[PDB]
Design a protein around this ligand. Sequence first.
Ligand SMILES: Nc1nc2c(ncn2[C@@H]2O[C@H](COP(=O)(O)OP(=O)(O)O)[C@@H](O)[C@H]2O)c(=O)[nH]1
Ligand SMILES: *CCC(=O)Nc1ccc(Sc2cc(Br)nc(NCCO)c2)cc1
Ligand SMILES: [Mg+2]
Length: 167
Amino acid sequence: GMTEYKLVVVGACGVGKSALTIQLIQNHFVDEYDPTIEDSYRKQVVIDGETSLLDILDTAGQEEYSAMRDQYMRTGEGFLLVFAINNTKSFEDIHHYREQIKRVKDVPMVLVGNKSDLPSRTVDTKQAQDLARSYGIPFIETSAKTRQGVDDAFYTLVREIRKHKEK
Ligand SMILES: Nc1nc2c(ncn2[C@@H]2O[C@H](COP(=O)(O)OP(=O)(O)O)[C@@H](O)[C@H]2O)c(=O)[nH]1
Ligand SMILES: *CCC(=O)Nc1ccc(Sc2cc(Br)nc(NCCO)c2)cc1
Ligand SMILES: [Mg+2]
């Protein structure tokens, strides 16, 4: 059989939410994608031997209330909290995005440090590991540019959802 999963990607403007989503649904790096386009995308993959259909909401546009975004998040099964490793403000914003999820939802989440390919790092991996431990969630490093860690981010979120569903 198969299993479907309703996923959401959040994080500051410009961290690579769309780039990560497009690496998952198209397998290449799309470096220019309208920052205002918020939509859900579907991709069938196989995770640990099971056919898995991932619906992914790539959040975008004005950071003002959107009822469709709110209703999708309220019924979302898992969330990626994305920051960019060369942007300290994006990392400092993670708590804000996690609070928004807690206000609308045990919630499966994965902390994602994107843009790992950039040498201009400002957030140490150890800093991010401390934050993910404080939340009780996994931390995964990614590069949407090289595809490093992309399947790890999404598939770890699916594995967290499976654990949650067993409770
Ligand atoms: N070097 C590098 N650039 C990235 C990566 N992910 C995204 N980008 C770039 O970061 C910018 C914002 O990406 P985008 O996907 O639009 O971010 P979003 O606003 O979170 O959807 C664009 O210029 C992308 O080309 C990555 O992993 N590495
Ligand atoms: C630069 C464009 C961009 O990335 N915009 C963007 C980032 C992240 C989100 S997620 C979000 C934002 C806001 Br104001 N509120 C919520 N609340 C939960 C759902 O109602 C989520 C959106 C846009
Ligand atoms: Mg985008």
